[PDB]
Each structure stands twice: as C-alpha cells, then as structure tokens.
Design an enzyme around this catalytic site. Sequence first.
Site, PDB file in Angstrom:
ATOM      1  N   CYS A 231       0.845  -1.186   0.000  1.00  0.00           N
ATOM      2  CA  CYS A 231       0.000   0.000   0.000  1.00  0.00           C
ATOM      3  C   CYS A 231       0.882   1.237   0.000  1.00  0.00           C
ATOM      4  O   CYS A 231       1.468   1.597   1.017  1.00  0.00           O
ATOM      5  CB  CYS A 231      -0.938   0.010   1.210  1.00  0.00           C
ATOM      6  SG  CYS A 231      -1.401   1.655   1.811  1.00  0.00           S
TER       7      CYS A 231
ATOM      8  N   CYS B 229       0.525   3.592   2.774  1.00  0.00           N
ATOM      9  CA  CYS B 229       1.017   3.038   4.033  1.00  0.00           C
ATOM     10  C   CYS B 229       2.548   3.062   4.125  1.00  0.00           C
ATOM     11  O   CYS B 229       3.118   2.837   5.198  1.00  0.00           O
ATOM     12  CB  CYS B 229       0.497   1.614   4.196  1.00  0.00           C
ATOM     13  SG  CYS B 229      -1.279   1.455   3.835  1.00  0.00           S
TER      14      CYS B 229
ATOM     15  N   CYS C  37     -37.352 -25.453  40.866  1.00  0.00           N
ATOM     16  CA  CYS C  37     -37.572 -26.061  42.188  1.00  0.00           C
ATOM     17  C   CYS C  37     -39.035 -26.469  42.443  1.00  0.00           C
ATOM     18  O   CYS C  37     -39.365 -26.997  43.512  1.00  0.00           O
ATOM     19  CB  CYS C  37     -37.063 -25.110  43.285  1.00  0.00           C
ATOM     20  SG  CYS C  37     -37.483 -23.355  43.060  1.00  0.00           S
TER      21      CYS C  37
END
Lengths: 490, 490
Positions: free
Chosen positions: B38, B41, B386
Amino acid sequence: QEAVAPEDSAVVKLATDSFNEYIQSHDLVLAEFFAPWCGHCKNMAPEYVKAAETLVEKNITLAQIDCTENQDLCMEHNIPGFPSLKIFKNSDVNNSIDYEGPRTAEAIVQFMIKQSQPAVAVVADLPAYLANETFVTPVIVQSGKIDADFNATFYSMANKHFNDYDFVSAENADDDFKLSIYLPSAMDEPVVYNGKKADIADADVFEKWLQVEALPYFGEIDGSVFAQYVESGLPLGYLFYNDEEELEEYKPLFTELAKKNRGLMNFVSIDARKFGRHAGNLNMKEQFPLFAIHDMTEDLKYGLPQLSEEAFDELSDKIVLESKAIESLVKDFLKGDASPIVKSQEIFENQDSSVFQLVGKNHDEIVNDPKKDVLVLYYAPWCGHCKRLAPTYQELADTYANATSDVLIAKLDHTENDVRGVVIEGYPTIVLYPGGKKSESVVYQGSRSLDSLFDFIKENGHFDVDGKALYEEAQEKAAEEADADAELAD
Amino acid sequence: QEAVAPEDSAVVKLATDSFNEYIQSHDLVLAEFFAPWCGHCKNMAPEYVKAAETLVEKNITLAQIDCTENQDLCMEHNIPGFPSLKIFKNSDVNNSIDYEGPRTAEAIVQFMIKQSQPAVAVVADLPAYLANETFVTPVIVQSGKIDADFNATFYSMANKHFNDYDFVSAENADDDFKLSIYLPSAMDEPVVYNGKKADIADADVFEKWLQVEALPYFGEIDGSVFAQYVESGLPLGYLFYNDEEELEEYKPLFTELAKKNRGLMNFVSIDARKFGRHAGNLNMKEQFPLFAIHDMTEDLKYGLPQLSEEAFDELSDKIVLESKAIESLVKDFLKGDASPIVKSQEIFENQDSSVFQLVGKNHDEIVNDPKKDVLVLYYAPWCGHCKRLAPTYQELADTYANATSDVLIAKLDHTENDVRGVVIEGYPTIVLYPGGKKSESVVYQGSRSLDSLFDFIKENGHFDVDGKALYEEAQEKAAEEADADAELAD
C-alpha cells in the site's frame, strides 16, 4: 496415548496463542498448567477427562497448558510445579489460587460448584421473588418466550455484572416477550421497553440501555452514582435542597420530568448543606433551593435565573422555584434556546505587567483581531506546572512588549472564567490565535523554555516575528548601558 | 528500506502474539493496521515516525500491524482498507473509530491531544483546588516526595479509574511523604495513612485500601454504592431511619464507630419508608429505627434485640436505640459473641405427604441421625426449577415411604428458614446426609429424573437402598390389584 487429552476428549488445550483472551472472556476458568513427563500430570488425566465430558453442563472450563511447548505463557503466569491447578474466578490474570485439593473427577466435580455463579434467577411467580427478595439493587427481568440472541446476552451480561444489578430471567411461556427493569424506587412502574430486539442483543447496545434506564428517575447524587450519571451523555439537571419538605415538595415534579425526557437529559437532587460550594462550579450563586442544568458534553450551565444579590440578605422569607418556571427552563434548553452563563470576572482597568490578564468578555474579542498574533495562557491559579511558567511568560512578554508591540502575550484564568472557544480539560493549556485571515486552533504543544515559544510564535506565527533575535539584541544592550568604564581602572 | 518502521525508529510494531494484552493495558492506543505494498502506508510512514520519536513524552502509542504476516489478528479486528488508523481509547477491543483525518505527523500529533487523559492533578496549593473544585467525588492525594513505586501506580490506577475518584498528585517537595484521601463528607479530616509503602504500591493492595477507605464512614446505602459495600468483606451495620431528626440524632454516633472499627466492619443508614421490606431479609421485624449487622461472608444477621410484638401495636411513643446498646452489640459481634437469629417457622404438626416440610429448628437434628439416609431439598417457593421437582420428589418419596421407611426424603424452605449448615447461593440445592458414622457434605449434582436420585440415594447411600427395584416391584403390584378379569370376557 501418553498424557494428551486427545481430539476426542471433552477438553480444549488452551495454547499460548491466547490464554488471556480466553480467560477474561469466560466467567470462571479451571486451569491445569501441566507437563507430559510429570507422572501425576498423566496419572490424573483420565480424571480431568472424567470431569470433562460430564462437566460441560454448567459450562466448566478444562484447560490443559502443555508448559513444555507453551513455555513463554508459563512466564506471564507464576507457576510453582506440575501439575498446577491454579483456577481463575471472575477471570482476570491475577486471581491464581493454586488449588492443592484432590486430583479426582468425582472429587473436583464438586469444586466446580465452589463458586457457582447463579447470575440469572429463573422464577415461577416474580411477585414472590420481588417481595421476598428486597434489595437496594434494581433488577433486570424478562418473561414471555426468550429468543436465541438473549439467553447468552441476558445471562451473559449479568454473569459479569453483579457489580450493578439483580438479573431475573423468568419465563411464564404462555406469554409474549418482555424486558422490564424493576427500579428500587417505584416498582409498581417497571420499564416499558420498546421491542427492537435483534439489535438490542449486544453491548454497548443492551448495555447503554441499562446505563440509561437503570438510574432512578430522580435519585440523590452520591459520589458513587455520579460516575454513571456521567457515563451517559445526558445533561443532568441538579436541584438543591435545604429541607426535605423542600425535597418532597419538589420530588414528584422532577420524577415526572425525567419520565417524559428520558433519553434527552437527566435529573438529580443535591443536599445544599454539604454542597453549597459546588453551586459556583455550575456558574450559579448559593441561593437555595437551586435548580440548574449542566451540559456535560460542552461545559455549559443553565440556571433558573437566580434572584439578585442586593435582595439576598434582605430576604427573611424563603426561596421557591415555581414548577411553571422549572419546565420552561428544561424545554428551552432542549429547544436550543436557554441562556448559558460564562464567569467573566470584572475587566482589568489596565494594570501592571506585560502579561495581559484576560476575561471571558474580552477573550472572545482580543483573541481574534489579526493585529496582532496573540498568544494565550489558559490557566488556573493552583497547578504546579502553570506557575513555574509566568516567570518565563513575563520575560517572554517583556521581550515582545518593547519591540514593535504587535504580538500580544496574555493569560486567562479558567477559575472564575468560562471560555466558549477551544480548551483542553487541563491547564496550563497554551494557544496562539492569528485571526480572521487564518484559523486560530493552533494549540501549543511542547516544553516551557522561552526558547520553545519563541520558535512557536515565529514558526507558527502570522507575522514571522523573531523574538529570539530580540532576546539576543536586548541582553547585549543591557550589558553596556550600565558599566561606565571610566569610573575607575584598574 | 521500503515501508518498515525499523529497529532504530520510535515505534513498536505490535504483532499478533498479543495485540489485546497490549491494547487493554495501555490507557489510549493509536493503531495503524497496514500493508507494505500500500503506497499510502509507505507514503506516510516517515510521518508516523516523525509523530513517533517526538511523541513519546505523553507516552503515545505507535502501532504498526503488518496485516500481511499478522493476518489472523486482522480477523479479530474488522479492518476496512489500508492504511487503517482505528485508534483505541479506554482500550478495550470494541472502540475502533476508523480515523480518516490527515496522514501527517504535525497534523495528527495534535489528535493525540484529542482525548488527553489528565488523570493526575498536580497542584501548588491544594487548599485552592479542594475549594475551587467542589465535587461529589472523593479524591486521592499525595504530597511530600514521591517514590518510584508510586508515580506509575498513583497515576497508573487513576489513569484507569475516573469511574471512581479524583486523583491529585501534588508535591510541595519541602515535605515528608503522604497519602491522604479527602472524603466528600468531612474534608477537614482526610486519611491518616500508615506508611508501609513498597507493598502498598500495587493492586489489589493499593486498590483494597481505597475500596476500604474511599467509602464515607457513614453514608447512605444506594443501589449503586451497595456494590462496593459488598466488594469489602467487612460486615456492614445497617441502621434504619424514619425521620432525619432520627437520622441526625444517630448520625454522629455511627460515624464515630466506623472510625474506630475501620477495617473490621462497615456502617450505613437506610430509609425505612422505601425499605421496610428488607427488614425481614436481615431477620428483623419492621420496628424502626432499626439497627442490625449482617455478616455478609457467612449469612448471619444480628439485630439490636427488637421489642416484642404484643407491645408493638400498643406503643404510641416512638422507638429509640440507646447508644450504650448500639456499641455493646458491635463489640459483642466482633468478640465472636453476639446472637445470630435463624428464621425457623413453626414446626409442622405432622401433616399431608411423604415429603417432610422441614424447619431450621429440626433441620439441624433430622439431617444428622444415621437412621436414616435423609435426602434434603433446600428450596424457595418461587423458582421455576424447584417446583418442576416436587412432583418427582413425591413419587420419589412415596416409593421409599411404603418400603422399609428408613431413608427420609424431605424439603426445607429457605424463604422463612435460615440453615446453619451447607448451602449453595441458589435453589433448588439438593443434599443427602448419612450422619455421625460418615460426613454429610454429599451434594447432589445432576438431572431431576426420579432415575438420577434413585441412583444417588443408593449409589452414594449409606444403606445401599435400591429404590428403582421398588419402582419396578411397585408398578407391577398396581398393574394387577385393580383388574378383576372375571368382570366380563370378551
């Protein structure tokens, strides 16, 4: 087969790749840092497996860490010897209780119910729970019929969030969906939750909604709660109390406000006896009871237009905020209308030194004009770093004073002075402002040296004004002026 | 040299090895997920470097992530395209604002002062700060001369702890060391901190001490604060109020207690108007004002011996807790002396079914005796799981009733019944208790099937009692008994 928990076994050999990402995600991890040649670490492996396939129904974690190959992970974890049964709870990488209890399946199966974390509370009759279980904690609750994007979001969040709420996940299946939040104040009225669901099945989405709705419409403002009152973005309206007749004459009204404007702005009360001294911090005189708003996002305070000072001492009768006025303020604010109130001190009738002490009223003005390249010290009178500065700042300012005046060098006290323009939370913030030919968001970042600013003020300066050259030229001229030579010699 | 930030550059290329352990440790990370080919970059890399060597003085993070080789880390992070400048704030791996602003050094240098986190507040005069800055937040502060194990522990903790306190790190160097904590109630009195330092320079050590001392000796008990009142281990003593004359007649006394016993047990008040209904939850009648202690660690409540019921209605005069009595309770408790009070309901004068409804008073007894192998359902009347149980539990109990009585099968309601013995936080907890020939911490873990208990009750049973064989034998005997054959045929 040696000491491997093989591919067919009911365990995941966590590797060095990411122990921590696995630990801190899971609510209660049960490690076994081991070595293969350690007889015991083989000679209880069927028991780890036998406490594996059976123990996934309370999703227990079995974690073999071959400290042979996963060695560098044994470093980030202070291992004694093999096998290591340091088992992690809430699951950060601190709590490492090196459990020296039995190395059997039918033994330690039980120790996985050492810290059972029943976050969710399934019920048949919520009425009972709600009333049998009194608590200061608001409770999140869902009934109806639970979607997939929900049991492991509701149970999920809770699992790592008792530091916050009680989390009932009830389900009278003969019922359409629901997500109430029973607030400890008015439990009669829980939460009308509007049902866009598949998006409100994650954080920070599910999250932000609690962060909004879990706050009691009109609670007190503890130091504690004040955290999450700011984890909000909603401007909160502070009201101050002296008596509780004063609290409870007002307490209904503000609830009813907070209910309508639920998402736009918040509401709290605040004993004035212990915090009159905040009053000013919201740009507001200490006359009570005092209502004021604070736009936390941009630092703007709106008061109900407090009564005058030359009728303060003259006022034996008390103080009363007519509801009609309370609302009209709130609406206004939200309309983008209400008056915010800066703390311009009184404008300095030209006094001592080359550093101009500025005020809110002038600041807007003086910072602008292109004549000149004004530097500004945004400061407060207490911090260490902002006073080891004015000495330079003077022998900075003085250098520019004498020379073609132009570039103003000024300071502005942020105690007793709001500024509408740019600011950092903390002082000493320093800024140069060219003007209306080019922008003024030119923030100083660097050292304190006279040197570094003299750079800045030319470097990033409209006029290109070499102050250093002056500070050369200047100190030379004050080297001669005095010494008369002819006084005496030798 | 291509697109590398080389070994000589002022950046640390974070690798896949541990992005997250690096992110969430650091207070404000500035990422750059990039690829080498890139151009951009590469064609802004000197700027990342130029915003590197210069930008470490506000310890800024430069983080190049070569998404070529560190690829699998690009997965755990939703990268758009290269270069990616998603920069992380408080630093979890959610907040990923893909910053599309300039790719220059002298540009983004400034954006590292986008969220400046001035946690520490250096001052010259604390007096000013303390008073100029009013707040509901307690503040941690140190003066004197600061050790190495301190700037990056004090600044450290704070940095990731504004959700909690204000953190002044002042230093009038001409002064010996100090670590006060100015509490929002009495600021006159800050914290006498005893100086064992090199150990109190870490968490959970530095931590636990705030968690102790940052709580206002005698504050109210919000839902919010109640979190950290339990993140404590210190039994808190609750006092209930009706009026504030009732609050403020008492409010000094309890402060003075909490001061002496600071580390042993805590103290809070609690409006009885909104929480009378908690009273019982601390095993305590709704007579106010009501003081009670709660040993949070083992679930034991101690009340100031509340007055009788047959003089409750007959009592127009109000209620008063003599200080002398208040202390004597506290001391007692801590001596290991005070009476804790179980909620034994009234003992069931033998009634209906094969499931024995038990009580605290009997429970201690019946669970023990070796005759018989008693199973126990520790339960509460509301939870779903329960109650879908008692149906089995009956056709369980009935099977053992008829056959050689022996093994008792019983239930005990934990609402209106404390039990001294073993318990899990949540119901339905199930336990079998052999007796005084062998221990009774034999907790049931498994399914609900009649099958699974019939296993348990023989499998882990003292008498070795094949209930299944009965449930074979039994259903056969009730297959014949009725049908008379000779009635008619065909």
